[PDB]
Design an enzyme around this catalytic site. Structure first.
Site, PDB file in Angstrom:
ATOM      1  N   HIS A 224      68.062  86.799  30.323  1.00  0.00           N
ATOM      2  CA  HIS A 224      68.407  85.456  30.773  1.00  0.00           C
ATOM      3  C   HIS A 224      67.387  84.450  30.265  1.00  0.00           C
ATOM      4  O   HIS A 224      66.210  84.528  30.608  1.00  0.00           O
ATOM      5  CB  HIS A 224      68.448  85.393  32.303  1.00  0.00           C
ATOM      6  CG  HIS A 224      69.610  86.114  32.910  1.00  0.00           C
ATOM      7  ND1 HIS A 224      69.647  86.478  34.239  1.00  0.00           N
ATOM      8  CD2 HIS A 224      70.779  86.536  32.372  1.00  0.00           C
ATOM      9  CE1 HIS A 224      70.787  87.099  34.492  1.00  0.00           C
ATOM     10  NE2 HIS A 224      71.492  87.145  33.377  1.00  0.00           N
TER      11      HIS A 224
ATOM     12  N   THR B 274      70.804  84.053  39.990  1.00  0.00           N
ATOM     13  CA  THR B 274      71.230  85.362  40.497  1.00  0.00           C
ATOM     14  C   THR B 274      70.230  85.980  41.478  1.00  0.00           C
ATOM     15  O   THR B 274      70.393  87.123  41.909  1.00  0.00           O
ATOM     16  CB  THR B 274      71.479  86.370  39.355  1.00  0.00           C
ATOM     17  OG1 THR B 274      70.252  86.620  38.664  1.00  0.00           O
ATOM     18  CG2 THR B 274      72.521  85.828  38.375  1.00  0.00           C
TER      19      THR B 274
ATOM     20  N   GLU C 118      73.837  92.140  34.993  1.00  0.00           N
ATOM     21  CA  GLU C 118      74.324  91.451  36.173  1.00  0.00           C
ATOM     22  C   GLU C 118      75.776  91.086  35.917  1.00  0.00           C
ATOM     23  O   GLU C 118      76.649  91.364  36.737  1.00  0.00           O
ATOM     24  CB  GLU C 118      73.468  90.223  36.445  1.00  0.00           C
ATOM     25  CG  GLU C 118      72.034  90.609  36.750  1.00  0.00           C
ATOM     26  CD  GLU C 118      71.335  89.604  37.611  1.00  0.00           C
ATOM     27  OE1 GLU C 118      71.262  88.426  37.201  1.00  0.00           O
ATOM     28  OE2 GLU C 118      70.857  89.998  38.700  1.00  0.00           O
TER      29      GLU C 118
ATOM     30  N   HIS D  78      59.620  90.977  41.032  1.00  0.00           N
ATOM     31  CA  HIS D  78      61.073  91.092  40.955  1.00  0.00           C
ATOM     32  C   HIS D  78      61.472  91.482  39.533  1.00  0.00           C
ATOM     33  O   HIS D  78      62.453  92.193  39.321  1.00  0.00           O
ATOM     34  CB  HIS D  78      61.723  89.759  41.349  1.00  0.00           C
ATOM     35  CG  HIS D  78      61.324  89.271  42.709  1.00  0.00           C
ATOM     36  ND1 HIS D  78      61.629  89.957  43.867  1.00  0.00           N
ATOM     37  CD2 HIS D  78      60.638  88.169  43.096  1.00  0.00           C
ATOM     38  CE1 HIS D  78      61.147  89.298  44.906  1.00  0.00           C
ATOM     39  NE2 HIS D  78      60.541  88.209  44.467  1.00  0.00           N
TER      40      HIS D  78
ATOM     41  N   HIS E  97      63.629  86.240  31.232  1.00  0.00           N
ATOM     42  CA  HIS E  97      63.324  87.476  31.933  1.00  0.00           C
ATOM     43  C   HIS E  97      64.536  88.382  31.767  1.00  0.00           C
ATOM     44  O   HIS E  97      65.571  87.944  31.253  1.00  0.00           O
ATOM     45  CB  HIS E  97      63.091  87.202  33.422  1.00  0.00           C
ATOM     46  CG  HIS E  97      64.246  86.526  34.094  1.00  0.00           C
ATOM     47  ND1 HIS E  97      64.352  85.155  34.190  1.00  0.00           N
ATOM     48  CD2 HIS E  97      65.378  87.031  34.642  1.00  0.00           C
ATOM     49  CE1 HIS E  97      65.500  84.844  34.765  1.00  0.00           C
ATOM     50  NE2 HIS E  97      66.142  85.964  35.049  1.00  0.00           N
TER      51      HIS E  97
ATOM     52  N   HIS F 122      66.970  91.911  33.477  1.00  0.00           N
ATOM     53  CA  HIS F 122      67.459  92.661  34.633  1.00  0.00           C
ATOM     54  C   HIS F 122      67.851  93.976  33.968  1.00  0.00           C
ATOM     55  O   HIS F 122      68.497  93.966  32.922  1.00  0.00           O
ATOM     56  CB  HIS F 122      68.689  91.984  35.243  1.00  0.00           C
ATOM     57  CG  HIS F 122      68.410  90.625  35.806  1.00  0.00           C
ATOM     58  ND1 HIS F 122      68.002  90.425  37.108  1.00  0.00           N
ATOM     59  CD2 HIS F 122      68.445  89.400  35.229  1.00  0.00           C
ATOM     60  CE1 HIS F 122      67.799  89.134  37.310  1.00  0.00           C
ATOM     61  NE2 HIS F 122      68.060  88.490  36.185  1.00  0.00           N
TER      62      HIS F 122
HETATM   63 ZN   LIG Z   1      68.077  86.473  35.635  1.00  0.00          ZN
END
Ligand SMILES: [Zn+2]
Ligand SMILES: [Xe]
Ligand SMILES: [Xe]
Length: 257
Positions: free
Chosen positions: A116, A195, A103, A61, A91, A93
């Site tokens: 995050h 999320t 996000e 992911h 991590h 995004h």
């Molecule tokens: Zn995250």
């Protein structure tokens, strides 16, 4: 199970995780005109001096940098938080293009990516226990825009080639997360959720106002990772972000102005 594709993406998560349509889902859009300054918010305290990274892995992911959370060697406190929260991992995004990736959004603006840093409330003994509490986690969110290179991110970038496919991991020691922070700690905060599935509403979000700058060379490396495992068809790991969700009956408070 889930993913970010058309057949298993954010629009499908609610089937396996009904809370996806919950009352405190994240991320959300931050309307600076409505997110007002709260003079009662205490100074945010980020203490990462004794951070002890263990490894970095590709979970299919995104990639996670895990930390040893056995002691209060890297904690977040103050701000809207009641108590102390230990850093367990971080991590990102990011998107397939610079115009998208984050996000959370500010006045609808999307950043190239978002970091995050996940922490759990020590009053609960461990991460597993905390995640099932409304005040179990505190996630520090930091926006990334493309420009100058971020020196503190290079150590990460330099090892992404070793965890290209889902399921790969590598020892990753002595990484200092302080090198990923912007100058200012001004922030916006609101009660939210994870999320990604299970999407548990156990997070107090702290989103920093100031983004950090990373170079195009650095973001390009993120975009070379794969969602797929070793062997199967190549599926570039890009656009692993959930869109803004309804704010519902929540308030977003600002620590500044
Ligand atoms: Zn995250
Ligand atoms: Xe679990
Ligand atoms: Xe990135």
């Amino acid at each position: 199970h889930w993913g970010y594709g058309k057949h298993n993406g954010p629009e499908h998560w609610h089937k396996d995780f009904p809370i996806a349509k919950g009352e405190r889902q994240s991320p959300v859009d931050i309307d600076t005109h409505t997110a007002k300054y709260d003079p009662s918010l205490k100074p945010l305290s980020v203490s990462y001096d004794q951070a002890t990274s263990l490894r970095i892995l590709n979970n299919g992911h995104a990639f996670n940098v895990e930390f040893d959370d056995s002691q209060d060697k890297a904690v977040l406190k103050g701000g809207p938080l009641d108590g102390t929260y230990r850093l367990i991992q971080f991590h990102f995004h990011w998107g397939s293009l610079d115009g998208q990736g984050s996000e959370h959004t500010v006045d609808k603006k999307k950043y190239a990516a978002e970091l995050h840093l996940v922490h759990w409330n020590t009053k609960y003994g461990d991460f597993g226990k905390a995640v099932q509490q409304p005040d179990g986690l505190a996630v520090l969110g930091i926006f990334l825009k493309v420009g100058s290179a971020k020196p503190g991110l290079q150590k990460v970038v330099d090892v992404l080639d070793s965890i290209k496919t889902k399921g790969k991991s590598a020892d990753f020691t002595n990484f200092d997360p302080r090198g990923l922070l912007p100058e200012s700690l001004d922030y916006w905060t609101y009660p939210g959720s994870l999320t990604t599935p299970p999407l548990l509403e156990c997070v107090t979000w702290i989103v920093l106002k100031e983004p950090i700058s990373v170079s195009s060379e650095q973001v390009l490396k993120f975009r070379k990772l794969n969602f797929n495992g070793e062997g199967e068809p190549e599926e570039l790991m890009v656009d692993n972000w959930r869109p803004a969700q309804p704010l519902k009956n929540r308030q977003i408070k600002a620590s500044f102005k």
